[PDB]
């Protein structure tokens, strides 16, 4: 399970029809400690008239990212690999219509 690891460390959010804002996710026990996550500005999307269109949806596009967590806790030299979901931006989708 253990390996040797060497350390070797666009206005879209505003211009999108599904705009978003970045939110600070900070964890001192994690590397990267700070992760900037996208949160969709509206439920709907922006139409050709520049207004919010309720019949389209701004949805966050999420991806699995690899993070290091101190193991055991508060140990600066020992870590565990973790997979977390982060929102990197938002997209505009036509909604799903539900019936039974």
């Amino acid at each position, epitope marked *: 399970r253990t390996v040797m690891v060497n350390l070797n460390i666009s206005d879209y959010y505003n211009r999108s029809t599904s705009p978003w804002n970045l939110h600070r996710n900070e964890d001192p026990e994690r590397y990267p400690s700070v992760i900037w996550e996208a949160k*969709c500005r509206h*439920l709907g999307c922006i139409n050709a008239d520049g*207004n919010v269109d*309720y019949h389209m*949806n701004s949805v966050p596009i999420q991806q699995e990212i690899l993070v290091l967590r101190r193991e055991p806790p508060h140990c600066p030299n020992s870590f565990r690999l973790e997979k977390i979901l982060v929102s990197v931006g938002c997209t505009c989708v036509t909604p799903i219509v539900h*019936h039974v």
Partner: antibody
Amino acid sequence: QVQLVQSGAEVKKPGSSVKVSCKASGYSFTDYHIHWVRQAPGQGLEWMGVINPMYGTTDYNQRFKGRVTITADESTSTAYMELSSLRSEDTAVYYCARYDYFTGTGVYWGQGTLVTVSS
Amino acid sequence: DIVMTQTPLSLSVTPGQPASISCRSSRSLVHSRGNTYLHWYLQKPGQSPQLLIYKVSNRFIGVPDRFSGSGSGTDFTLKISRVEAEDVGVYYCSQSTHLPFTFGQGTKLEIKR
């Protein structure tokens, strides 16, 4: 079956903030939007805002300015509306409604919540 | 904000007699992808609004056929072929095409028994 239960009536002093809850059941909470609509005594209905419980994405009525905050808790199937800096004019019955894309409007409604703004 | 204007504001109808309510919006209620989000609700005092008609002309499950909807663009009409006692209340038209969603003033229906 499909059901929306709101929190009991409240009395708030001018300038305070009120938080009304809306407990959902009989369906998958995350799959439907929750809207909030109010009605001042002997007055018409007024749309306040909307939440997408799946992502927490919201849209508000500009008339209320930055006074309304709508939120939803996936784990307790409950949506909440928070109206700050209360005025006498904010005395009203507050409703929650779940909308859908087939009907295009609010089918299922909460019972209502009366909020009296008084010192 | 879209303005919804209802005519008349009040009505007193003999049970068995027909009733009609007009709804006119300040702008067309036709959506970019083709649907018309005009709906009709009935509200009984100290009760939540009940859905009567959705998308101009569709009756909601459980709504008797005495209720009917018609119209296009900015002018819409709710018709009741035979008024019944259970019909007492305030009727509202509502648009869900444009944000913020809006309702009419409401029309009060009184039963002339």
